Amino acid sequence: MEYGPIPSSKFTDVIHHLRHNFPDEPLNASVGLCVHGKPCELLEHHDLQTLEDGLSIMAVESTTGEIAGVALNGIARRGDVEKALEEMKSIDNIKYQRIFGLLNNVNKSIDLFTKYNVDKIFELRILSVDSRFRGRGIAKELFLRSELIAEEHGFKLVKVDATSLFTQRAAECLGFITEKCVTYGDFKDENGRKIYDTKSPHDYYKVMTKVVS
Numbered sequence: 001m002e003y004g005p006i007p008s009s010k011f012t013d014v015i016h017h018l019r020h021n022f023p024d025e026p027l028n029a030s031v032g033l034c035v036h037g038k039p040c041e042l043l044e045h046h047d048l049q050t051l052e053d054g055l056s057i058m059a060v061e062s063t064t065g066e067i068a069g070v071a072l073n074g075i076a077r078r079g080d081v082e083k084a085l086e087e088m089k090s091i092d093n094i095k096y097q098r099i100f101g102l103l104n105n106v107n108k109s110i111d112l113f114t115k116y117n118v119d120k121i122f123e124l125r126i127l128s129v130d131s132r133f134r135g136r137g138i139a140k141e142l143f144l145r146s147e148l149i150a151e152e153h154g155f156k157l158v159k160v161d162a163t164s165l166f167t168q169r170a171a172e173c174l175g176f177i178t179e180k181c182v183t184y185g186d187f188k189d190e191n192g193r194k195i196y197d198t199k200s201p202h203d204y205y206k207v208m209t210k211v212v213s
C-alpha cells in the first residue's frame with residue numbers, strides 16, 4: 001500500500017474510481033443522485049477543482065498499480081459557502097439541493113472562520129476506498145496523511161463533513177472534535193415524509209475539526 005500525491009495524468013483514473021465506488025455514500029444513497037459506473041458530471045466538476053488545489057492524496061495497490069482509495073482536500077475560504085448557496089439557486093436539480101443545501105446550511109450555520117479566527121480551512125471533502133480494498137484501515141491512513149499535508153502547507157484548522165460514521169470513527173481516532181451534530185431524520189418534506197431516509201448505522205451527520213501546526 002503506497003501513499004503519494006495525485007499527478008494531473010491520473011485525474012480520470014480517480015473519476016472512474018469515484019464513479020465505481022463513491023455512490024454508496026450514506027447521504028447520496030438516502031436521496032439517490034449518482035450510481036455505479038455511470039458518470040455524475042454535476043459533482044465530478046467540483047471534484048476536478050478540489051483536485052486542482054493539489055493537496056489531495058491517493059493510495060495505489062503496491063503490486064497491481066490499481067487506484068485503491070483517495071482523500072480529496074480543498075482550501076475553503078470566507079464567503080465560499082454563501083457563493084455556493086447563491087449558485088445553488090440557479091441549479092434546478094431537487095436531489096442536489098437536498099444534499100448540498102444541508103451541507104452548506106449546516107456549515108454556514110457555524111462560522112468556523114470566526115470561531116477559530118482563520119481565513120482558509122483545510123477540508124477533507126471526499127474520502128473513497130474501493131469496494132474490494134475496503135476495511136483494511138486505508139481511510140484511517142488517508143485521513144492521517146491528509147492532516148499532515150495540512151501542517152506542511154501551514155494550515156491551522158482541518159474540517160470534514162463526516163456523513164459516514166466510519167468517517168466519524170477515523171476522525172474520532174485522530175482526535176477531531178464534533179462542531180455540529182445533526183440527525184438525518186429531523187428533515188421532513190411538505191407531507192411529513194423523511195427527506196434523508198438513511199439506512200443505519202448512519203443516523204446523523206457530524207462536522208468535525210482538529211487544530212494543527
Ligand SMILES: CC(=O)SCCNC(=O)CCNC(=O)[C@H](O)C(C)(C)COP(=O)(O)OP(=O)(O)OC[C@H]1O[C@@H](n2cnc3c(N)ncnc32)[C@H](O)[C@@H]1OP(=O)(O)O
Binds near residue numbers: 026141
Ligand atoms: C454526498 C457527499 O459528497 S458528502 C461527502 C462526505 N462523506 C465522506 O467523507 C465519507 C464517505 N466515504 C465512504 O463512504 C467510504 O466508502 C468509507 C469511509 C466507507 C471507506 O473507509 P474504510 O477503508 O472502510 O475505513 P477503514 O477501513 O480505515 O475503517 C476505519 C474506521 O471505520 C470503521 N469501520 C470501517 N468499516 C466498517 C464497517 N463496515 N462496519 C463498522 N465499522 C467500520 C473501523 O472500525 C474504523 O474505526 P475504528 O477507528 O473505530 O476502528
